[PDB]
Design a binder for this molecule. Structure first.
Ligand SMILES: CC(C)(COP(=O)(O)OP(=O)(O)OC[C@H]1O[C@@H](n2cnc3c(N)ncnc32)[C@H](O)[C@@H]1OP(=O)(O)O)[C@@H](O)C(=O)NCCC(=O)NCCS
Ligand SMILES: CC(C)(COP(=O)(O)OP(=O)(O)OC[C@H]1O[C@@H](n2cnc3c(N)ncnc32)[C@H](O)[C@@H]1OP(=O)(O)O)[C@@H](O)C(=O)NCCC(=O)NCCS
Ligand SMILES: [Mg+2]
Ligand SMILES: [Mg+2]
Ligand SMILES: [Mg+2]
Ligand SMILES: [Mg+2]
Ligand SMILES: [Mg+2]
Ligand SMILES: [Mg+2]
Lengths: 223, 223
């Protein structure tokens, strides 16, 4: 199934997702040092999300490869591929694309639960707090905003190798007729200069709440 | 030479350091994906610091192995080893120890320069700024405190897998008779629970300013 990510992804990318840890999955041998000292719940999400990533790579025509980690934990894709990984309670998902047409991917999944006390204040600009109070529907807008901030960081970081704080992007939401999905824009408030290619002044994505999960995706195209 | 790190390291660890990038050094094949998309100055520090790490491992009786990156970029050491890496303008250094007697290592090097405008206020508790004004010597105490905070994070993170912010530790310095080296204590202000072993309520290290560099080291022993 591509049920949940199909509601946020445009064309030019492949995806895979699961909602549990299939028993007895293994990392590739090359990946073993990344999780040798990890707690079992970290091991599980690492292994299961890379099973999803190798399925998605296969839909691109790319054979199963180790997916290692680099600067600040960013995934290391095979030559000619960009992508993003996510895992939370009840979700693992991977999205990949060819770097010939896709510049960056960021995705994130969150359980559709209220944020813990104090978290909203720590992740919002004043203006975002005002905006969220005006958004329609029985949704955890705090959590959806959090999910979109996380996807924004994952799409930004591989293009800049610079920190992007919660106060460094203003996220604004649009809501479709369903009331359970729509678009967002992340307007960058700091130096937008990329390592390669045009400045990152804004990143556009989609959000969707379904099956107890918020998902967000940003797919920035190569021009 | 072990010149600069010899002024901050206790027993039970091996180290290696250089002040430039020896030309023609290569990553090991397994490390290539971590720097395949990096800018040249990031490749250089990554490659040279792992040359230092493999020398230091050799001093421990450990053969040359890839040093990959895991959660939040932490280095991935061979079974039975802990350690820390640092690189800045004019310095690469690696410190390793056996996990049977060493629990964690965090090291950091900084150019001995004033911090850029605004950085001191972003990295200090109000009380720290007042204490730094009290410390003696023609030293960049702002930079030395920054260097010690970075070492604190590197020692902390592999034991907790939790964020530690600048405001989450109070560092206090003592100054030796030389006026150019001494001890510091990092008092943890958040939940100190470790994943394994006793709580991290405080981390003790040494600092040394020499040859235009600040170096810090924390070596937490296994009991
Ligand atoms: C990196 C971060 C965003 C991940 O958020 P999260 O909700 O825990 O995300 P998930 O657990 O669903 O996904 C983590 C995956 O993201 C990817 N990722 C991690 N660091 C990354 C980075 N620097 N760049 C790109 N992708 C990264 C990894 O593939 C990771 O999974 P893996 O370790 O199994 O390979 C978060 O830990 C973080 O550091 N936040 C601070 C920065 C931020 O949010 N800024 C706000 C910007 S507006
Ligand atoms: C990780 C951090 C401390 C590195 O500081 P820095 O001055 O850039 O350090 P250096 O470049 O000298 O050393 C980087 C090395 O530290 C190691 N390191 C990176 N992340 C690490 C982590 N989570 N845990 C342990 N070591 C880590 C790596 O080996 C890295 O080198 P490599 O990428 O070539 O392998 C910094 O980037 C950071 O994230 N700071 C915010 C957290 C913090 O400082 N809190 C204050 C605590 S009181
Ligand atoms: Mg699919
Ligand atoms: Mg996570
Ligand atoms: Mg998430
Ligand atoms: Mg030595
Ligand atoms: Mg650095
Ligand atoms: Mg440093």
């Amino acid at each position: 199934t591509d049920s949940l990510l199909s509601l946020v992804l445009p064309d030019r990318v492949a995806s895979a997702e699961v909602y549990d840890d299939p028993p007895g999955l293994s990392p590739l041998p090359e990946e073993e040092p990344l999780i040798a000292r990890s707690v079992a719940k970290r091991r599980n999400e690492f292994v299961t999300v890379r099973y999803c990533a190798r399925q998605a790579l296969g839909e691109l025509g790319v054979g199963p490869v180790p997916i290692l980690k680099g600067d600040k934990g960013e995934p290391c894709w095979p030559d000619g591929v960009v992508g993003s990984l996510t895992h939370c309670q009840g979700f693992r998902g991977a999205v990949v694309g060819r770097s010939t047409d896709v510049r960056s991917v960021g995705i994130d999944a969150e359980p559709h639960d209220v944020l813990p006390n104090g978290v909203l204040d720590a992740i919002t600009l004043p203006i975002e707090r005002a905006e969220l109070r005006g958004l329609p529907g029985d949704l955890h807008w705090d959590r959806i905003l959090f999910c979109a901030k996380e996807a924004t960081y994952k799409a930004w970081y591989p293009l800049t190798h610079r920190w992007l704080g919660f106060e460094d992007a203003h996220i604004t939401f649009e809501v479709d007729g369903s009331g359970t999905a729509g678009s967002f824009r992340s307007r960058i408030l700091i130096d937008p200069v990329a390592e390669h290619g045009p400045p990152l002044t804004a990143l556009d994505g989609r959000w969707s709440v379904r099956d107890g999960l918020a998902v967000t995706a940003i797919v920035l195209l190569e021009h």
